[PDB]
């Protein structure tokens, strides 16, 4: 299952 | 721009025997950037029905892909993989050696 | 034994028109189980292992939503990074991200990872403690500060220590027939003469899973590395792996040489000799 949070722009 | 040249292996999925259906593989790895041209050749001619794996990469960020096609080996047919990449001045051809 | 779940993401900018090419793949150990490709017609996360087909429509809708969100983040990043590095609009550039978790033989959390690269070079990575960041250069340092203020590491630590391992354990159960099965290497040796005085012995390992393996030559019972060639482990295309190692030997002296194979699927290491 993919991470729903923590994938935010650099 | 970092540029890393592909390593190439050409081989069959299963032990190669004449008259027995099999898969011919071209595994390309260790390359960057991801754009790459891979053809499988039968007697010097490009094979049309070729599939490939979904692009992935290793810990060092270099890419790898498997290109493959169903084939039935015969005594006389010769096979090869032809690879082009930004790092290569001309296409690299690797012949299938049933012993490698 | 030990197991892992990993996701790999690649976005490649397309100068001249449209959004980047985005490819995402998920693995359990050495088995791919899902994919998303922006060039594909479905625009859905798609199954790549039979045991994931057990998941209901809510899973596929959810994974599709999340993976599309991942793609948009990379799109933005490609623009941001182009500006950070004073690059022109003419060139193609690449962002890569990998994250996931390892569990031990007891299926409890061992380690988590979250790493990011721009044009094939380290940019920013989560440290082993899942609390701080390794930034390679000053652009990545600006990102580190942004991510520290936004508590990104805390969010990732929660996923990597919790959700990631919970779902890994679910997959391991559901795919037990293959995922918990080790396939021992099928081994043989070939011989070729290059001339009247020189011969090549090639020790083969085929059909094995997982991919981790060691193949070594000994001569008269001691390790031989000189005059050897070891190919990279390669996929067979049916979920298993192949490798070989070769040694050049004086013709007639083949019996001095033994090949040694170590693999999870073998209770004790194997020995081969030219017969």
Give one DSSP letter per residue of B27-55, joined into a string.
EEEEEBSS--EEEEEETTEEPS--EEPPP
Give φ, ψ of B79 to 5 degrees: -125, 155
C230: closest CA among C215, C251, C248, C209? Answer: C215
C130: closest CA among C175, C105, C104, C100? Answer: C100
Helix C138-149 and helix C57-84, axial crossing angle in degrees, nearest 10 = 130
Give φ, ψ of C172 to 5 degrees: -60, -40
Percent helix, strand and coil across chain B, each to the nearest 5: 0, 50, 50
**What technique determined this structure?**
X-ray
Helix (H, G, I), strand (E, B) or coil at B86: coil
Hey, how many other C-beta atoms are within 10 angstroms of the C-beta on B48?
9
Helix (H, G, I), strand (E, B) or coil at C167: helix
Output DSSP code: residue C119. Answer: T
- Residue C59 has, within 13 A of its CA and on its CB side, a CA count of 10
Output DSSP code: residue C15. Answer: T
* Chains in touch with B (≥3 Cβ pairs < 8 A): C
CATH number at residue B79: 2.60.40.10
C-alpha distance across the termini of chain A, in Å: 22
b/e map C26-40, b = 16+ CB within 10 Å = bbbbbbbbbbbbbee
Distance CA B8, CA B81 (A): 8
Is the preceding peptide bond at B33 cis, omega within 30 degrees of 0?
yes
Interchain CB distance below 8 Å, A2 and C124: no
Q: Which of C92, C192, C235 sits opposite B33 (nearest CB)?
A: C92
| CA distances from residue B74 to B16, B25, B44, B97, C79 in whole angstroms, order as listed | 10, 16, 15, 13, 52
Nearest-Å Rg of the Cα atoms of chain B is 14
How close, in Å, is residue A1 to chain C by CA atoms? 6
Q: Which residues pair with C19 in a beta bridge?
A: none
Q: Please give the tally of structural domains in chain B.
A: 1
Location of each CATH 2.60.40.10 domain in chain C: 182-270
C-alpha distance across the termini of chain B, in Å: 34
Distance CA C198, CA C182 (A): 37
Distance CA B82, CA C76 (A): 35
Interchain CB distance below 8 Å, C124 and A10: yes
Location of each CATH 3.30.500.10 domain in chain C: 1-181
C33: closest CA among C50, C23, C48, C53? Answer: C48
Nearest-Å Rg of the Cα atoms of chain C is 23
Interchain CB distance below 8 Å, C10 and B61: no
Distance CA C127, CA C109 (A): 16
Mutate to test the interface with B, among C120, C187, C189, C208 (most CBs of B within 10 A): C120
Distance CA B25, CA C125 (A): 34
CATH class of C182-270: mainly beta
Interchain CB distance below 8 Å, C156 and A9: no
Residues of C in contact with A1 (CB under 8 A): 59, 63, 163-164, 167
**What does C230-248 look like in DSSP terms, one character per residue?**
EPPPEE-SSS-EEEEEEEE
Q: Chain C residue closest to B28 (CA)? A: C234
Positive or negative torsion for Cα C99, C102, C107, C109 = negative
Mutate to test the interface with A, among C24, C66, C117 (most CBs of A within 10 A): C66
Distance CA C225, CA C217 (A): 7
| CA distances from residue C78 to C12, C32, C133, C143, C223 in whole angstroms, order as listed | 8, 26, 20, 13, 49
Chain C 184-213, residues with CB within 8 Å of chain B CB atoms = 190, 192, 202, 206
Q: Which of B13, B35, B55 sits opposite C23 (nearest CB)?
A: B55
The CA-based angle C241-C271-C225, given to 5 degrees, is: 80
Q: Given CB atoms, is C121 within the 8 Å cutoff of chain B?
A: yes
Distance CA C253, CA C114 (A): 51
Residue B100: give the domain boundaries.
1-100
CATH class of C1-181: alpha beta
Residues of A in contact with C152 (CB under 8 A): 6, 8
Helix (H, G, I), strand (E, B) or coil at C42: coil
The CA-based angle B56-B57-B61, given to 5 degrees, is: 150
Cβ atoms A6, C152 nearer than 8 A:
yes
A9: closest CA among C201, C111, C136, C146? Answer: C146
Q: Which of A1, A2, A8 sits opposite C152 (nearest CB)?
A: A8
Cβ atoms C62, B27 nearer than 8 A:
no
């Amino acid at each position: 299952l993919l991470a729903g949070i923590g994938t935010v722009p650099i | 721009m970092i540029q890393r040249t592909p390593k190439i292996q050409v081989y069959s999925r299963h032990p190669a025997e004449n008259g027995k259906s099999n898969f011919l593989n071209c595994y390309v790895s260790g390359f960057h950037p991801s754009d790459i041209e891979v053809d499988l050749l039968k007697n010097g001619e490009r094979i049309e029905k070729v599939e490939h794996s979904d692009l992935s990469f290793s810990k060092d960020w270099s890419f790898y892909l498997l290109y493959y096609t169903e084939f039935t080996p015969t005594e006389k047919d010769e096979y090869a993989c032809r690879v082009n990449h930004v790092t290569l001045s001309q296409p690299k051809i690797v012949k299938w050696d049933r012993d490698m | 034994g030990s197991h892992s779940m990993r996701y790999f993401f690649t976005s490649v900018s397309r100068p001249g028109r449209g959004e980047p090419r985005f490819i995402a793949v998920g693995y359990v150990d050495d088995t791919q189980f899902v994919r998303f490709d922006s060039d594909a017609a479905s625009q859905r996360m798609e199954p790549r292992a039979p045991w994931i087909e057990q998941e209901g429509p809510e899973y596929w809708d959810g994974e599709t939503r999340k993976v599309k969100a991942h793609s948009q983040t990379h799109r933005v990043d490609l623009g941001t990074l182009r500006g950070y590095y004073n690059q022109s609009e003419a060139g193609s550039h690449t962002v890569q991200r990998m994250y996931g978790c390892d569990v031990g033989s007891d299926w409890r959390f061992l380690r988590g990872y979250h790493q990011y690269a721009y044009d094939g070079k380290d940019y920013i990575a989560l440290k082993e403690d899942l609390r701080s960041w390794t930034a390679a250069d000053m652009a990545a340092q600006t990102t580190k500060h942004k991510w520290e203020a936004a508590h990104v590491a805390e969010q990732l630590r929660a996923y990597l220590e919790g959700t990631c391992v919970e779902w890994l354990r679910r997959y391991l159960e559901n795919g037990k027939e293959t995922l918990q099965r080790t396939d021992a290497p099928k081994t043989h040796m070939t011989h070729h003469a290059v001339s009247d005085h020189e011969a090549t012995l090639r020790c083969w390992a085929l059909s094995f899973y997982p991919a981790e393996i060691t193949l070594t030559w000994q001569r008269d019972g001691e390790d031989q590395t000189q005059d050897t060639e070891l190919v990279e482990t390669r996929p067979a295309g049916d979920g298993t792996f192949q490798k070989w190692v070769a040694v050049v030997v004086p013709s007639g002296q083949e019996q001095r040489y033994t090949c040694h194979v170590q693999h999870e699927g073998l209770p004790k290491p194997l020995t081969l000799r030219w017969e």
